[PDB]
Amino acid sequence: SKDFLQLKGTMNAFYAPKQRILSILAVNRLFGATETIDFHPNLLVYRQSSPPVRLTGDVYVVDKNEKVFLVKHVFSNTVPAYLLIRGDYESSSDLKSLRDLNPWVQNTLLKLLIPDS
Amino acid sequence: NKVRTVTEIVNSDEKIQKTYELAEFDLKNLSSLESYETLKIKLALSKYMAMLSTLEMTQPLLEIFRN
């Protein structure tokens, strides 16, 4: 939909500007994208919060130094996915290793994170 | 401008006079001051860059201001 744009080089990753959200479909492909946007760190705007914003469910650490996390999220219409967030966050439960994630999301994350030097 | 010096022995009257042009010492002084000031300014600039690095921001300065 027009609410977001598919990230270049990804079949299951998109970004919603008005929401400032990067999302990765758990098991689903994107389709119909006539446009794509190059990934860039600015997209992961650091969320400011005097007390760390609490998070629930499955949480994974991407960059502890940069307060980057991956949060399991299901769209109310029951669409599984993960949200990549950067900011002052804390986890209600124990943080989980990324290896737990499926190869699909893992490949997308590698593409999005490792700079193409 | 210029100066001159006279050497003479106490018991003798045979004196040797030499003349000096101060421009050489002026050049020495100016070069010394220029080098010192350049060093100070470069030191300050390096210190500024270093403290900004200490803040440890990933992006370069211009990218930071563009974001």
What secondary structure does DSSP assign to A29-78, as a single string? -----S-EE---GGGSPPBP-SSPEEE-S-EEEEETTTTEEEEEEEETTT
Task: Report CA dihedral (B49, B54, B60, B63) to the nearest 10 degrees.
Answer: -110
In angstroms, what is the resolution? 4.1
Q: Which residues of B touch A42 (CB under 8 A)?
A: 67
Pairing of strands A36-37, A5-7: parallel
Q: Are A12 and A108 in contact (CB under 8 A)?
A: yes
**Nearest Cα to A45, choosing from A10, A16, A24?**
A16
Q: Which residues of A touch B58 (CB under 8 A)?
A: 41, 66
Sheet hosting strand A13-16, strand order edge to edge: A36-37, A5-7, A13-16, A21-25, A79-86, A68-75, A59-63
Deposited experimental method: cryo-EM
Both tokens of B60, joined, read: 């370069």
State whether residue A41 sits within 8 Å of chain B by CB: yes
CB count, 10 Å around CB of A24? 25
